[PDB]
Amino acid sequence: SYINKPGKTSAWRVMTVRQQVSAVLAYGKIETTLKKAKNTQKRLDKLITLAKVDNFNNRRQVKKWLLNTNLFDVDQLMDHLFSKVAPKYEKTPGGYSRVLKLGPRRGDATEMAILQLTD
Template sequence: MAGYRKLGRESGHRDLMLRNLVTSLIKSGRIETTDTRAKETKRLADKMITLAKKGDLHARRQALAYMTDETVVKDLFTDIAAKYQDRNGGYTRIIKVGPRRGDAAEMVILELV
C-alpha cells in the first residue's frame, strides 16, 4: 500500500499539482479544493512550515526546491515561521463546504490556523 494518494494523475502531474497547491496555500492563507487533494496538500504544507521553523540555509534550499515561487518561500521563512514557532504541528485546518455542483465531489476549505 502506498503512503500517499494517487489522485488519478500520473506522478509528474500529481507532484506539480501538489506543489502548486502548497504554494497557493502558503501565499494566500486559504484555498478551496477537493477533500482528498486537501489531505495530501495539508501533509506537504505542514512539512514546509516545519522546514521554515528550522530556518537554516539547508531548509531554505529544500523549500525553494519544492515550492514554485521564491517570494512565497521568503514570506514562509520570515512571517509564517515566526507565527508558528511555539506550535508543534497542526498548522492547517480543513473545513468541509459541501458537494461540488458538477460532479458532487466533496469540497473543503484548507487554511492556515
C-alpha cells in the same frame, strides 16, 4: 486500447501537490477538493516543520516547492515566510492547518473543503 488520457499518476500527484502548495502560499485560504487536501497535509505539515529551521539550506530545500505567481514572486515569498510566517507556527506541536468540509461541487458532486491556517 490506444492513445487516451494518461490519467492520474504519482508524478501527476507530485506536480499537483506542488501547485496547490504554491497557490496556498500565494493566498492562504483555498476552496478545493478535500481529497487533495488530505493528500497534501503531509507535505504542508513537513514544510511548516522544516522551514522553522530557518537557514540557507532550508531556503534551497523550500525552493523545490514554489512556483512563479502573479500576486507575488518566489523570492519575496521566501523572505516573508522565513522572516515571520514559518517561525510563527512554533506554538503548537503539529495540527497546523484546518481543512473543513464544505458542500459538494455543482458539476460532478466533488466534496469541497476549505483549507485555512491558524496556530
